Design a protein around this ligand. Structure first.
Ligand code: ANP
Ligand code: CL
Ligand code: MG
Ligand code: MG
Length: 329
């Protein structure tokens, strides 16, 4: 029969109305600087795609961050570069300062504006009800901007959100999985972290859109207000959907699959079963009560939906009552 097609509710055709060069990143030509302008101070951690260092720009003694890219396809490098260049100047978006190459190993490296992020492992337990609202609103600014620019982040999670609590600055980072949205394109579903993967990724629905980022944001919010990280703690991609099913119920899930005529992997058959949609009060207790409110739960409910078309858009979210104390200030 074949899966039912899907289009984005908002910002659907923004890339079509732009010059080819804007989104055709394969044909983008990179202008390199010299990595001798920078000296590495210390490593700030690693990943599967890069090693990240704090560094100094010897030309003006300013602190920067160098992200040396582990050998991936040139395409994926040009993509991250083109997207960062397109998103430059945007609200709460990380700034790409320069692009360099090691003279010896010819390994490409990205230079970013420095951000002094206090670790979320120690931060998300020191945040007040307002702070959560405030920073969530900041991320939404970033998401709305990049979506309006025709870009899906596809990797929204606490590790990719750098926060300077002292100056109350927030920067969304890691755009290595980011991609341009085109109506009717079927994307790779194997992106983002397991705990933040949307249902469309778990059931292998390729024609997704910006709303994927909104699910991930809901997962973040849930873990923050309930003090449960991660909120959906699955053992793998299949048990991850099961973990979700025990909360959002199985009824809406099977309706979602039916609406888009999704072919569900035979492996899910025996492991999903039947589960009711739980009320959010179940996850509330004395430890997190001060962060939970009727508005917080109403907002959270509108992000965590199986149907990606049924989730709030970034702009809609910013207009939710949950952010009234932030907008008033
Ligand atoms: N601009 C920055 N300023 C300060 N620290 C940063 C900056 N960018 C990245 N980091 C740190 O480096 C880590 C990983 O950087 P990241 O850009 O996500 O590379 P990555 O390989 O794409 N990570 P991931 O794809 O999620 O496995 C982050 O968790 C931060 O701690
Ligand atoms: Cl149950
Ligand atoms: Mg990252
Ligand atoms: Mg990455």
């Amino acid at each position: 029969s074949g899966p039912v097609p899907s289009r984005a509710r908002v910002y659907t055709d923004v890339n079509t109305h732009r010059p080819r060069e804007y989104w055709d990143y394969e044909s983008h030509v990179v202008e390199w600087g010299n990595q001798d302008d920078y000296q590495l101070v210390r490593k700030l951690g690693r990943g599967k795609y890069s090693e990240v260092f704090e560094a100094i720009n010897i030309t003006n003694n300013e602190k920067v961050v160098v992200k040396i890219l582990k050998p991936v396809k040139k395409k994926k490098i040009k993509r991250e570069i083109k997207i960062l260049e397109n998103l430059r100047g945007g609200p709460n978006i990380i700034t790409l300062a320069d692009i360099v190459k090691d003279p010896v190993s010819r390994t490409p490296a990205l230079v970013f504006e420095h951000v002094n992020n206090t670790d979320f492992k120690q931060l998300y337990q020191t945040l007040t009800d307002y702070d959560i609202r405030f920073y969530m609103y900041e991320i939404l600014k970033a998401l709305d901007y990049c979506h309006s620019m025709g870009i899906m982040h596809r990797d929204v999670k606490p590790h990719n959100v750098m926060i300077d609590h002292e100056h109350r600055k927030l920067r969304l980072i890691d755009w290595g999985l980011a991609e341009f949205y085109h109506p009717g394109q079927e994307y790779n579903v194997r992106v983002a972290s397991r705990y933040f993967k949307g249902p469309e990724l778990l059931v292998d629905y390729q024609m997704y859109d910006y709303s994927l980022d909104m699910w991930s944001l809901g997962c973040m919010l849930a873990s923050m207000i309930f003090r449960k990280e991660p909120f959906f703690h699955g053992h793998d991609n299949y048990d991850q959907l099961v973990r979700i099913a025990k909360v959002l119920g199985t009824e809406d899930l099977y309706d979602y699959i039916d609406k888009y005529n999704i072919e569900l992997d035979p492996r899910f058959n025996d492991i999903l079963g039947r589960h009711s949609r739980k009320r959010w009060e179940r996850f509330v207790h004395s430890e997190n009560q001060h962060l939970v409110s009727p508005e917080a739960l109403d907002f959270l409910d509108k992000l965590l939906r199986y149907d990606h078309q049924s989730r709030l858009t970034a702009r809609e979210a910013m207009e939710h009552p949950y952010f009234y104390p932030v907008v008033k200030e």
